[PDB]
Amino acid sequence: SLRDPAGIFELVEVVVYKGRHVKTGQLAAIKVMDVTEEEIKLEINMLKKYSHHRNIATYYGAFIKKSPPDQLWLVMEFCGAGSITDLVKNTKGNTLKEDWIAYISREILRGLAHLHIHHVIHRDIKGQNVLLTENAEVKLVDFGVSAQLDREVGRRNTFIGTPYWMAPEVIACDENPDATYDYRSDLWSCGITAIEMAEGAPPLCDMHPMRALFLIPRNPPPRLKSKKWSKKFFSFIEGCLVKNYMQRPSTEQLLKHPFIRDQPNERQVRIQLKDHIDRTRK
Amino acid sequence: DLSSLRDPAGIFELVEVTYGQVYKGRHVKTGQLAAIKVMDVTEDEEEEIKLEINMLKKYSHHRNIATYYGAFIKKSPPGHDDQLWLVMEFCGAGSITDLVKNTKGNTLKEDWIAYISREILRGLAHLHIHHVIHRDIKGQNVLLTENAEVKLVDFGVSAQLDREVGRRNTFIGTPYWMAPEVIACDENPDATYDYRSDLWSCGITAIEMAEGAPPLCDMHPMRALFLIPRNPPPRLKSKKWSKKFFSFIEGCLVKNYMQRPSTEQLLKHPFIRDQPNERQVRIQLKDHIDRTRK
Numbered sequence: 106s107l108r109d110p111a112g113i114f115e116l117v118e119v120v121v122y123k124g125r126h127v128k129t130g131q132l133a134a135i136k137v138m139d140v141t142e143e144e145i146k147l148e149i150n151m152l153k154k155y156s157h158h159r160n161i162a163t164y165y166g167a168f169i170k171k172s173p174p175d176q177l178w179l180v181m182e183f184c185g186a187g188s189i190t191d192l193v194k195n196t197k198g199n200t201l202k203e204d205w206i207a208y209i210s211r212e213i214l215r216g217l218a219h220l221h222i223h224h225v226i227h228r229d230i231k232g233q234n235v236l237l238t239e240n241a242e243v244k245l246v247d248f249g250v251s252a253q254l255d256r257e258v259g260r261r262n263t264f265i266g267t268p269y270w271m272a273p274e275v276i277a278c279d280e281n282p283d284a285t286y287d288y289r290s291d292l293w294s295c296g297i298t299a300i301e302m303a304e305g306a307p308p309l310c311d312m313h314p315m316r317a318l319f320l321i322p323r324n325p326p327p328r329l330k331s332k333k334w335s336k337k338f339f340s341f342i343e344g345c346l347v348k349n350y351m352q353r354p355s356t357e358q359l360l361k362h363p364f365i366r367d368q369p370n371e372r373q374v375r376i377q378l379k380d381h382i383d384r385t386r387k
Numbered sequence: 388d389l390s391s392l393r394d395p396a397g398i399f400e401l402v403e404v405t406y407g408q409v410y411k412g413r414h415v416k417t418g419q420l421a422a423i424k425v426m427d428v429t430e431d432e433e434e435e436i437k438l439e440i441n442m443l444k445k446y447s448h449h450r451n452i453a454t455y456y457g458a459f460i461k462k463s464p465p466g467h468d469d470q471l472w473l474v475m476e477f478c479g480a481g482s483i484t485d486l487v488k489n490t491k492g493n494t495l496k497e498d499w500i501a502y503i504s505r506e507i508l509r510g511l512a513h514l515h516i517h518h519v520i521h522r523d524i525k526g527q528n529v530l531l532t533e534n535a536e537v538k539l540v541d542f543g544v545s546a547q548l549d550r551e552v553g554r555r556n557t558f559i560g561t562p563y564w565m566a567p568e569v570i571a572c573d574e575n576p577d578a579t580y581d582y583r584s585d586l587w588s589c590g591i592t593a594i595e596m597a598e599g600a601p602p603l604c605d606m607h608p609m610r611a612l613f614l615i616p617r618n619p620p621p622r623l624k625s626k627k628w629s630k631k632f633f634s635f636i637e638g639c640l641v642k643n644y645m646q647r648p649s650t651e652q653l654l655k656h657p658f659i660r661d662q663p664n665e666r667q668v669r670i671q672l673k674d675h676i677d678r679t680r681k
């Protein structure tokens with residue numbers, strides 16, 4: 106069975122949380138997901154294999170902090186440098202250098218390719234859920250655990266969250282009454298996350314959520330506001346954001362996109378991000 | 388003051404040491420308890436919030452509304468998000484949802500439902516007469532005092548008790564109590580909040596009391612969101628209920644809000660208007676609240 110984390114792990118502050126292994130002082134990242142009084146344990150134990158990939162935060166264990174008056178704690182490796190969303194927020198002009206966006210986007214795609222190959226959909230790709238280590242490595246938070254929880258109807262799948270990263274196919278309407286979706290929905294999210302890095306927020310961020318939900322299936326694909334960006338960047342965004350998912354490139358195709366595939370300054374970019382992380386952290 | 392955005396220092400304080408989490412607080416000058424919802428805000432969020440305060444209407448205290456005491460900013464260091472405090476009268480006897488959950492069988496007698504529903508409509512009438520829409524009527528946002536008073540949640544610019552599932556103004560929320568007109572759908576491109584949306588939610592809340600859950604509780608939220616504008620209005624599953632109750636439900640849940648009754652008309656509906664056992668009901672509610680604290 107799954108334990109209560111007391112005396113094993115404790116929450117420090119939020120970043121997903123900074124958590125601490127109580128007995129050893131080792132740090133961990135803790136994804137807190139409310140849950141309903143078993144088979145949670147089972148899925149985690151199937152999926153945890155997958156978290157070993159370098160671009161996914163490795164699973165440490167899982168715990169539930171009971172109870173009515175429940176909460177799942179997904180414990181994973183600590184990424185000291187915080188989320189890419191915090192990075193952009195703490196960056197002047199709320200925008201990252203294009204070649205930083207190329208590096209980070211590729212790392213996200215490598216992590217996703219790993220899940221997708223094994224028929225896992227992440228379902229929650231956004232800047233908030235992509236973390237950085239001190240050495241500026243890029244790791245996805247979660248690896249299908251929250252995806253499985255969003256499946257079950259019940260008292261802990263009663264809310265619709267933010268719509269800004271949702272692909273068109275995820276949003277029901279009369280020609281799409283069953284909100285049919287697959288792994289390619291994660292790639293639309295990656296595109297939205299790339300804009301997030303470029304502009305500081307996803308498109309439609311200033312719109313009422315309900316209205317954004319209405320506009321996504323009906324508006325053309327979002328584009329970068331500014332023309333300062335390269336043709337290759339615009340092209341990468343276009344690929345992530347193919348309106349009809351049936352024609353959207355897969356993860357392996359996007360990994361071959363010139364924006365992603367050709368990064369002659371990688372070593373330097375990592376060095377720049379590392380320094381930027383230091384200068385900008387709060 | 389319900390129109391300025393001050394530091395809460397020396398006006399309100401937390402007594403009990405999460406985003407949108409509600410804490411027990413205290414009015415500094417009078418010692419009167421309060422419920423304090425605390426939220427991180429960026430600098431930009433602070434401008435948005437100032438604007439929403441200008442948009443707020445003026446209305447008096449009301450026995451069926453948990454008094455909104457105002458909005459405040461708790462300063463954090465430069466580079467760090469400040470805190471928004473939304474301050475409300477303290478109601479210590481839980482929500483109507485807690486009430487249902489603590490009732491054996493998770494269901495309420497019909498005369499309890501009439502009583503509570505009436506109190507809800509009275510709060511709503513006060514808001515509506517003042518050109519205010521509540522926007523979030525559900526069992527969770529209707530509170531009890533230790534005196535068994537029924538009070539609508541009012542955090543001013545926010546209408547919910549539980550912690551916001553995401554950053555303010557960025558999440559869709561739970562769809563179950565939403566009227567059709569507030570759901571953007573193929574035929575409703577401009578999601579209408581109208582005062583009558585609260586009356587639909589009121590109807591849903593009465594089913595919530597009668598059955599323990601809102602209609603469509605067996606659907607994933609996104610599927611429910613799709614269904615609500617498309618389905619005919621929901622109904623009570625059981626036939627055990629009085630004709631009056633069925634008629635009240637049907638009154639609240641008129642599909643087209645333009646053809647749905649006003650609060651004043653619903654307050655005259657026999658199910659609401661004729662409560663021969665209300666004195667007993669209140670007594671019964673108070674005993675229930677007493678038993679529970681034990």
Ligand code: NA
Nearest residue numbers: 157158161163
């Ligand atoms: Na890993």
